[PDB]
Each structure stands twice: as C-alpha cells, then as structure tokens.
Amino acid sequence: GLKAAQKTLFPLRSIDDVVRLFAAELGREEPDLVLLSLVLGFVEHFLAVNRVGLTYFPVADLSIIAALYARFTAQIRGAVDLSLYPREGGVSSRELVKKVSDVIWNSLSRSYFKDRAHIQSLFSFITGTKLDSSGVAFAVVGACQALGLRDVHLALSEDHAWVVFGPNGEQTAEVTWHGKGNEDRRGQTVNAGVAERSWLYLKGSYMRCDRKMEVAFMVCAINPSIDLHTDSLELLQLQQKLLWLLYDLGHLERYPMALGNLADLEELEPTPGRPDPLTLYHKGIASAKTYYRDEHIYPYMYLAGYHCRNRNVREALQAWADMATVIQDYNYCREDEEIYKEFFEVANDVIPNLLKEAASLLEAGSQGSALQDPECFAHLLRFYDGICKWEEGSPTPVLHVGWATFLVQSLGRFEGQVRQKVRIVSVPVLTFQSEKMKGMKELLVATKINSSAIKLQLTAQSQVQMK
Ligand SMILES: CNc1nc(NC2CCN(Cc3ccc4c(cc(C#N)n4C[C@H](C)N4CCN(S(C)(=O)=O)CC4)c3C)CC2)c2cc(CC(F)(F)F)sc2n1
C-alpha cells in the first residue's frame, strides 16, 4: 505494498468514511481492487456475519486492513513467479492467467457450501479460504492487478464470470467453475459458448470490465443479508451510497444490472433528489440496448419485478413480453438452466398469481383491469411466443406439458370478447415469430378455450390416449 496516500483516511469509522475511501481510490490511476474488497469484506463480516459487540460501525483500523492486504500479496507473490512468464509486448500470457487461477483455486478449503452468503470477497478468501464462483474470478483479477498485469480484466455474463487479457484485451480465459456438476474448463476460451448462441455467453455481448466496472462489481457483490428475514440497514446504505458514487462518476454506464440493483435500493429507501426507480430501470434497459445489442434478459426482469410488486399487471406483462423477445434469438443450451428457471417461475407461478388477484378484483368491479385490456392479452401471447421461438433450433427443449396447464389457465383469465380484439397478423395487432404460436392462433378466441388442443400445440405432442 500500500502507498502512503492510500493510508491517510484510516481508520474508517463510518459508512461515509468507507465512501470516502472508494472516492479516493476511484480518483487514482487504477483503484486498488484488493484494498477495496478487503475493506468491504471486513465491514460485511462485522455487520452481517457476526454483529456481537456492534454499537455503530465496525471500525476498520489500518493495522488490521494492512495485515490482511499483506497476507494476500505475500501469497500471490510467493506462488506466482513472473520470471517464468515473460510479458511479451507488456501484456499477459494464457499460461500466466492459468497460473494465477490455479493459485487461487488451490488455496480454497477442500469442502464447503459454495452457495453460502458472504464468501464473495477477499476477506472471505483470506480469513476463511472460501470463495463463491464469481468470487474466484474477481480474486484472479485482483491478484493480477497486484502483480502489475494491467491487461487482465473481469468479464461478466448474466450467470458467469471469466477474464479477458492479452493483445488488445482480445483473449478470453475461464478462471472459475460454473454451476454444479459441470466440468471445469479453466484455461480455455469462451468461443464455443459464444458460437453456440447460449444465454450463458450472451452471443459475445458480455461485459468487458475496466477497473472502475470491477469496483462496481464488488459493490453489487455486497450481501446485506443477516438471515432469511433480516437485512443489515448499514450494508444496504453502504451499497446504495457506493452505487450513487459510481453512477455520478459514469461507471454504471455500461453495467445494466447495477442500475437495476440501484433502482431496487431506491424503491426500498428513496434518496431525496435522485431519479425514481422506474427511471433507473429504464436506464438499465437503455444501457443494454446501447452497449450490448439489447441481448440481456435481466434489465427487463428487474423492471418486471418492480411492476409485479406494485401489482401493475399491465406493465409487468409488457416487461416480461420484452424479456421473451430477447430470449427468442438464443439457443437453449446445457448450462443455461438459471434463465430457464426464471422463465418457468414467471410463467407457472408469478403470472398465475397476479392474474388470480386481478380476476378477484375484476369481480369486485375494478376499472381499467389488465384482464379487460386486449393489449395485455397481446403481451401474454408475446411472452409465450418468445419462449417458443427460443426453443426452435435449440439442442435441448424448453416446453413440456407441465407448462400447458398454466397457459390454458392464464388464457382463460381473459374473457373471449377481450381475446377476440387482438389481430394476429402474418409476415391491437401482434405478429408471431414462433411456429408453435402461429398454429395456436385459431384456438385463442373461443369463448371456452380448447384445453386439449392447446396442450397438443404447445408440446407438439403427437397423440391422445388410446383408450
Ligand atoms: C447487480 N449486479 C449484478 N447482478 C447480478 N445478478 C443479479 C440478477 C438479479 N437477481 C435478483 C432477481 C432474481 C429474479 C428475478 C428478479 C426480477 C424478477 C422478475 N420478474 N425475477 C424473477 C423471479 C421469478 N421473481 C419474480 C417476482 N418477484 S417479485 C415478488 O419481486 O415481484 C421476485 C422475483 C431479480 C431482480 C440478483 C442477482 C450479476 C451476475 C453476474 C454474473 C456472475 F457470474 F458474476 F455472477 S454479474 C452481476 N452483477
């Protein structure tokens, strides 16, 4: 190592002192990822993992943080001999990146629950020898910065992390695991995943972080959870203030999910004089459109969740239809199961519950109901259309009969006279991209929907029961 100028704000006695440290580091040529992650991990430990003795804020003394920092830089410098890996042209080699990955990996405890909270930071790595999946990727990047490897940067999809490096930053390397019961690909490129058009690799439209975005990542990685029913107000405030600092400096520009996180925090506890949650959700979508070809799913997911919490059925349906319009141009691959799970839960649990309450409210005489709005029926249809189109061409199927009962129920929440008002046009008006929905068209306006025919069309089931 730490330089004199990095040390002058210690001790950190409050949330605002932590914010000052982040501001000072963000003003430097390269913010120190190791320092910053150790500080966050330290305060998260004493605010969420063990609050014994807490009276206000866990003071972070320089002696304590500097000793943790020294434990990290000693391990890395001792285990990675840079002379074995000459930096050709002032950039890093694949072998060096895989060395650093191995040093982090091999340090980890032999057995632990990888799903646990509060194992994301370098504090966890040093004091518990535990990291979560993306935590390992972050740690590799922090280690490379500590070694002077300016070209190694964090790469992020919506469900995975790796690194970029090398000439023009054009190389990719896996540095951590993905999911459970997948085989390690550490050291390899991500090109096969890009080429197969999986969601996991975002068709190549993944985030390539600079150092400031790596700071944003560790701030998003703060976990305020104390338990299933309790969050640390202190950590919520810290994360919120840090995200506003990053926002003001321009470092959330290219980070859609961070904008959604900030919107969620503002919904919980609004900051006076700041943009409303909707504004922020829409900025997150705009970031995805601008920098990532509109190939990201979660910006719409964050927006839909806000509308669903506020029981705004219309706008929730629109955002989930928009969700589906992105997924339709992907192939559903091995290792995409997390996004399948989210679409499944929206289709088969969230939408049904939202429409069930809308039906009860309509019975009690609600006006302007989504259930009497043909544009809302069109959004529901567009949601299913995008899921059906996603499945086309995919190496693994999406739909099955366990989806069909919920489709029939949801369709039936709209009366036939509402459903009749949507005009399905071929290449309120809607065009279908999927063959499954094109063949379902003439079932969609009957007063009583033909449940059996819908199931056949959605699952492309060939036959009915013999007897
Ligand atoms: C912030 N930066 C960041 N975040 C990353 N991942 C986050 C992505 C969002 N999730 C929270 C989450 C989860 C599910 C969500 C939603 C929103 C919806 C909807 N609809 N849905 C669907 C589910 C079914 N429901 C619907 C109903 N709502 S409700 C009751 O509130 O109405 C609850 C959620 C959200 C916000 C948190 C984690 C990642 C991931 C990265 C990759 C890697 F590898 F690094 F980890 S980087 C990153 N950055």
What is the DSSP annotation of 24-69?
Answer: HHHTSSS--HHHHHHHHHHHHIIIII--TT-SS---B-HHHHHHHH
Q: Name all contacts of 250-254 with Cβ < 8 Å and 24+ positions apart.
A: 251/26, 251/212, 251/213, 251/215, 251/216, 252/216, 252/287, 253/287, 253/291, 254/207, 254/213, 254/287, 254/291
Q: Which residue bears the tokens 């589906």?
A: 324
Q: Please give the Cα distance from 171 to 165 (Å, whole number).
A: 5
User: Rounded to the nearest 10 degrees, how much is the dihedral formed by the CA atoms of 312, 313, 314, 318?
Assistant: 100
Nearest to 197 by CA among 292, 284, 295: 295
Q: Closest Cα to atom 30, ligand 1: which residue?
A: 309
Q: Please give the Cα distance from 132 to 153 (Å, whole number).
A: 18
What is residue 192's three-state secondary structure?
A: helix
- Distance (angstroms) between ligand 1 centre and the Cα of 181 equals 22
β-pairing verdict for 230-231 and 225-227: antiparallel
Which spans in 292-373 are helix H?
298-309, 313-327, 337-345, 351-363
β-pairing verdict for 207-208 and 225-227: unpaired
- Distance (angstroms) between ligand 1 centre and the Cα of 88 equals 40
Q: Give the tokens for residue 338.
A: 């997390």
The DSSP annotation for 102-166 comes to HHHHHHS-SS--TT-TT-SSHHHHHHH----HHHHHHHHHHHHHHTT-TT-EEEE-SS-EEEEES
What is residue 293's three-state secondary structure?
A: coil
Task: Give Cα 462 to chain centroid, integer Å.
Answer: 38
Number of separate helices (H) and strands (E) present in the chain: 21, 8
Ligand 1 close to Cβ of residue 213 (< 6 A): no
Look at the chain and count its residues: 467
Q: Terminal CA-to-CA distance of the chain, rounded, Å?
A: 79
Q: Which residues contact 52 (CB under 8 A, 6 or more apart)?
A: none
Q: What is the identity of the amino acid at 220?
A: C
Q: What is the identity of the amino acid at 3?
A: K
Ligand 1 close to Cβ of residue 261 (< 6 A): yes
Query: How large is the C-alpha radius of gyration of the chain?
Result: 25
Ligand 1 close to Cβ of residue 301 (< 6 A): yes
Q: Please give the Cα distance from 204 to 210 (Å, whole number).
A: 17
Q: Which residue bears the tokens 């989806």?
A: 403
Q: Please give the Cα distance from 309 to 322 (Å, whole number).
A: 18
Question: Which H or E element spans position 288?
Answer: helix 277-291
Strand partners, 154: 163
Question: Which H or E element spans position 406?
Answer: helix 401-412
DSSP letter for 8, please. T
Ligand 1 close to Cβ of residue 316 (< 6 A): no
Q: Give the tokens for residue 207.
A: 């985030």
Cβ-based burial of 53 (10 A; exposed 0-12, middle 13-18, buried ≥19): exposed
In contact, 347 and 382? CB cutoff 8 Å: no
Q: What is the resolution of this structure in A?
A: 1.3
Buried b / exposed e along 190-225 (16+ C-beta atoms within 10 A): beebbebbbbbbbbeebbbbebbbbbbbbbbbbbbb
Q: Determine the longest span between alpha carbons in the chain, in angstroms.
A: 84
Q: Please give the Cα distance from 380 to 376 (Å, whole number).
A: 6
- Distance (angstroms) between ligand 1 centre and the Cα of 301 equals 7
Q: Please give the Cα distance from 241 to 81 (Å, whole number).
A: 39
Give the CB-side neighbour count of residue 357, counting CA atoms within 13 A. 11
Q: What is the identity of the amino acid at 140?
A: V
Q: Please give the Cα distance from 26 to 11 (Å, whole number).
A: 19
Q: Please give the Cα distance from 430 to 437 (Å, whole number).
A: 11
Q: Please give the Cα distance from 145 to 113 (Å, whole number).
A: 28
Ligand 1 close to Cβ of residue 324 (< 6 A): no
Relative orientation angle of helices 298-309 and 256-268, to the nearest 10 degrees: 20
Q: Please give the Cα distance from 156 to 139 (Å, whole number).
A: 14
Strand partners, 462: none
Q: Please give the Cα distance from 65 to 448 (Å, whole number).
A: 68
Q: Please, what is the Cα angle at 418 between 363 and 311, to 5 degrees?
A: 50
Q: Closest Cα to atom 33, ligand 1: which residue?
A: 305
Give the CB-side neighbour count of residue 241, counting CA atoms within 13 A. 16
Q: Give the tokens for residue 208.
A: 């390539």
What is residue 172's three-state secondary structure?
A: strand
Q: Which sequence spans correspond to the domains of the chain?
A: 4-225
Nearest to 302 by CA among 286, 320, 276, 290: 320
Q: Which residue bears the tokens 């994360």?
A: 239
Phi-psi region of 335 (alpha: psi -120 to 50; beta: other; left: phi over 0): left
Ligand 1 close to Cβ of residue 350 (< 6 A): yes
What is residue 227's three-state secondary structure?
A: strand
- Distance (angstroms) between ligand 1 centre and the Cα of 302 equals 7
What is residue 466's three-state secondary structure?
A: coil
Ligand 1 close to Cβ of residue 219 (< 6 A): no
Q: Please give the Cα distance from 337 to 371 (Å, whole number).
A: 31
Q: Which residues contact 96 (CB under 8 A, 6 or more apart)?
A: 80, 82, 85, 87, 149
Q: Closest Cα to atom 20, ligand 1: which residue?
A: 305
Q: Closest Cα to atom 3, ligand 1: which residue?
A: 257
CB neighbourhood size of 84 (10 A): 9
Q: Please give the Cα distance from 251 to 26 (Å, whole number).
A: 10
